[PDB]
C-alpha cells in the first residue's frame, strides 16, 4: 500500500513469530524497543521491504542484542550482540519500575532510614528515576535505577506533596540488589496535602462557565486514506508513530497548482532532556531523557472527546509492542482536527473601495505523554499560508523537595516547608529537509545596522546579511535575538519566478539553552542542548542527537561525533536539528497542579511560492 | 454611574455646545482630537466631574488651542494657545488627506513630472504621508504633508501595484500651496496588477473548506453592565476607547475569594511607529506614528459577524467626534467573545490512579484599524489562570516601490520590477500598574549560571538574580534572551502566605528594537523604540512615549524627558512602558495581500496567588 503506513498488530505478531522461530525470542528475552525502519534513500526500489528494528534485553544476565527483521520476507536480516558498558544500556522497561519499591521494602538500611523518620513502609512510594553516569565505577556495565521517596497518606493521596528529603537509594534491577542507600539527614516531611480533587482545596466549583460548542455539520475538510495519509488544504503528509519518538511526520508536501512540492521529508522530536538545577547530592544526578531513556510514545495517554480534544475529532490508535512481542493498542492516542485561527488577511482600501477579509485555519495533530510527575502535549500545526509550527505543552505536577530552613538559591518554595528545584525542559527537533527536493543548504540571516553617512543620510537604512553554512564543522550555531537571527533552508537548484532560490525560514523562540556547566556529566551526554541549531549531512544511522543507547551512556555519542565528519552540506541531503526549551523556576501558582506552559518554533515560506498561496481561499 | 463609561453622543454634543457658547468653536475651528480625561488620582472625591480634552485646529491660520471642558458643570476649565513650531503640530485631519491630490493636480511641476512618464493625472493617486522634521527649515511652524504617487488603471484597481518612483512632493495644507516637487529620475511603472479579487489572479476558489461552527447555546460566560463593564471568570475591568489610543483597558482586577484584587489600573498601546529602511531620498523621510499622528481609533473598522469575529459575539459601538464636534458612531467597532484555549492542566497519576483534565479559556477584546496601506488588529487576552496577553496582527498591503535594476540592499523584490522597502512595526504599551494597589516596584530577573566546584559538584546548579530598579535614571532597560531576562512588578507591602511579595512577570518576545542610527531624526523622535522597557513615576500629564503633539515635532518630548526627573520608583505609583515590534523584510508571499504576522507580550502571576487559582474550574 504505502511504505509509511502504521505498524499493524499483525506485523507486530509476525515479528514475534520471526524472532521466535529464529531462537531470538526465548522465554527470557524482553523487547525494550521495537519500531519500523523508514524506507531507504532511493525510493526507486519498487516492492515493499517492511523492516523492523528491535532492541532485545536479557533478564538472566546475557548480553542484549540489536536485531533487524524483515516481516515481508519473514527473515531476520541482522543480529548484533551489544557491549552496554561501551555503547550504553537499553531503554528502561515498564516491569523494572515496579522492582525498585519492592526491593527496597525489604532492605535493612532503607527500613532503618524510614524508621528514623517514623515513616510506615506501606505508605512510602519510591520514584524509579534513570541513572546518569557519575562517580560510581561499579555501575559501568550494570543496569541501574535510582529511587527517591514520597509519602502517600492514603491510596488517592498525591505523594508529590510529601517528599522524603535526605534519602536516595541506587538499585541494580537485573541482579536485583540494592547497591547503596545514602542518608544525608532528616528533613521534616511536608504535611499539607496537594489533592486538587479534594473539595476542601478546590472550594465550591465555579458555575459561571457556559458551554462553547465547536462542531462541523458537514464533517472535516481533511481526508484520511490508507490509515494514516492526510490531505488538507493543499497539504499532504503521513502521520507515523514510533514508541520512542511518538508522533512522527513523513513526506510533508504542498500542492502548488499542478505540482506536489516536498518541504520536509521527516519530522520528529528526537530527544528531550529535563535537567535539574539542585546542587544537593540527593538530586544533582537527576536528568530525564524522556525520549532516549523512557520512550515517549510508550507512555502515551488515550485522549477523551470533549476533555482532551474538542470539536470534530478523528483519532488514530497506534500499535506498540509490549515486552514480550504482543501487539498493544494505544486507543485514541492521536488527535486530529482543524481549528479556526482568526483573520488570515484583511484590507479595506480607500482608493478601490474594496473590503477584503479571509479567515485562517490550522490543522492539529497531537498526542499527550505522561512520565512520572509530568505530562507533555506534543502539537504540530499546519496553516493555510504554508506555515508549519510545533508546540510543546508542559503540565502535570512539579517534582518536589523539602524547602531548607535557611532558604535556597536553587529551589522554590511552594507551600510551608515544601520546595521545588529549578530545572529546564529541553527539546530537540529533527528536521529531515526536502525543500523542493533533497538539494538543500542553510543560510544564517542576521539583521545589519547601518551607520549614518554615505548611502545613508538621515541614518534610517538597515539591511540583512546571509552567510551559507558549507561544512558540518561550521554548522553549529547559537541564537541572537538582538540581531534577529534566523535560518533559511533553501534549494539552490529550484527558483521562483523572480529567479531566486525557494526557501523556508526558521523562527526560534530564543529561550536559553542548557545552563549546566560545560564540563558536567549532563553537558557531555546532552551536548545537543548546548546550541540552538545543528545541521548535518543525512545518513541512515544518524537518528538521535544523543545516539541510539542513551541510558547510562557516558557522552559524545550523538551530534558531537556526527559533526566531526565535516561533510559538505552546501546543496546536499541535509538534516536540521533545532534545540529549544523552558527554564522553569517554579512559582506558587504551579502548585498543586501545574497550568500549561509552552515552547516551540515555526517555519514560514521564504520565497517558496510565486505569490501569496492563499489567494484562492473563499469567504465563508 | 461609572466614571469610566464610554463617551455618549449626548456628551459629545454637550462639548460642542459648551465650546460654541464659549466662542471657542467658531465656523473656522476644527476638532483635531477630543477624548475624555481619566478620573484624578484620588478616587476619594465623590461626584462625577466628567472632563474632556480637545485639540482645536484653526483653518484661517490662527494658533491652535488645547482646551479642557467639564460637561458635568457645563463649563470650559482651561484654554491654552499653542506654539506649534515649538511643541509640535496637531494630529492630521481626515479632510486634509484629500487636499494633497487636488492641489498637486493643478501644479505645473507635478504635471510636468507625470508627463515625462506618460501618466494621466486622472489615474494618479497620491498618498498623503506625514512629514517628519528634516533639513527644510521653512517647514517649521507650518503644517506639512508629503505625497507619493501610485497609478490606478481603473476605479477598482490596486494602485499599490503601480508605484511611481523618483517622485515626491511636499504640500502646505493650511495655506494650500505645494512647497516642493522633487524628481530624481524616471523609473518604469510596474505593470502587473495586484487585484486579489480578480479571478485571473485568484484562479478557481477552493471548494474543499467545510464549515467550522462555533456557538454557545447558553450564551457567553461574561456579563456587561453599564455599557462597558465586564465580569468574566473572576476578572473585572472596563473597556474604554480613545480616538488616539483605540481600545483602552481600565481597572483590571481579579476576584481572589472574597477580595477584588487590582492588577492593572490602565493599559493601552500609547504609540506605534513604522520606520522605513530605504535610504533613497524618495522615502528616507517615511515614518508613520499611527497613534501619534494619525490617531488609531479614528480609522477603526466596523467588524462583521462570521468574517471578522466568529462565535457568540458581543459588540461595543464607540462614539467619536467628527471635525465639527458632531457625534460619530463606529458601529461594531469592538469585538468581545470567549474562546476555548486547549488544555489548562492535566495529569494521569500512577500512584493515586486519578486522571485529571481541565480546559483553558481566554476572553478576547479586539478592534481593527486601517491606515493607508496597512490594517492592524489589536487583541487583548485574559486567561483563566490569571495571565494577561496582548497581540498585534499586521496585515493589508505592503508599501511598494520600484525594484532598482542593479538590485538593492534595502528593498525586496515582490514581482517583476516591483520592490518593497524594509521596515519595522514598533509598538509601545503603557501599563499603569496597580499590583494589589499602587505601591509597586520593578525587579529585573536574570538567569545565572554557576561554575562547577564548591556548592556545585557535578556542575548542574543554576540560579536567578533579581535587581530592583529604584530611580527613574536606571529604569531604562534592554532585553537579553540569552540569560532569559524578564521583569517582575511587585507590591512590597502585600505578601502571600509564604510571606513573599505578590507579583506578576513580564515576558517579552525579544524582537529587535529600532534599527535606525542613534543620531537620526527618527531616533530622537521615537526614543522610546530604542529600549525594551522603561519605568516612570506616575503623573497625569505623562501620557505618551512621544509626548502630546507628535506631528512634525523635533524630538525628546516623551520618555527621555520624563525619565530625566530621576524620581523614586521603589514602592510607588509606577508606569511600565514596553517596547515591542516586527522587523519586516517583505517576501514574495506577502504580495499582493499580506497574510497576518504577530507580535506581543504577556504577563503571568509570579507568586500573586497563594496556590493555583484554577483549582475550582469544573470539567465540561
From Swiss-Prot, chains A, B:
It comes from the Bacteria. It catalyses: a primary methyl amine + O2 + H2O = an aldehyde + H2O2 + NH4(+); 2-phenylethylamine + O2 + H2O = 2-phenylacetaldehyde + H2O2 + NH4(+). The keyword Oxidoreductase applies. Signal peptide: none annotated. The modification 2',4',5'-topaquinone is found at residue 374. Binds 1 copper ion per subunit. Induction: By phenethylamine. Substrate binds at residues 288-299, 371-376. Cu cation binds at residues 423, 425, 584. Its cofactor is Cu cation; L-topaquinone. The active site is at 290 (proton acceptor), 374 (schiff-base intermediate with substrate). GO terms for biological process: amine metabolic process. Keywords: Copper, Disulfide bond, Metal-binding, Oxidoreductase, TPQ. PROSITE patterns: COPPER_AMINE_OXID_1, COPPER_AMINE_OXID_2. One of its GO terms (molecular function) is primary methylamine oxidase activity. Its EC number is 1.4.3.21. NCBIfam families: PRK11504.1. Catalyzes the oxidative deamination of phenylethylamine to phenylacetaldehyde with the concomitant production of hydrogen peroxide and ammonia. This is Phenylethylamine oxidase. The lineage of its organism: Bacteria, Bacillati, Actinomycetota, Actinomycetes, Micrococcales.
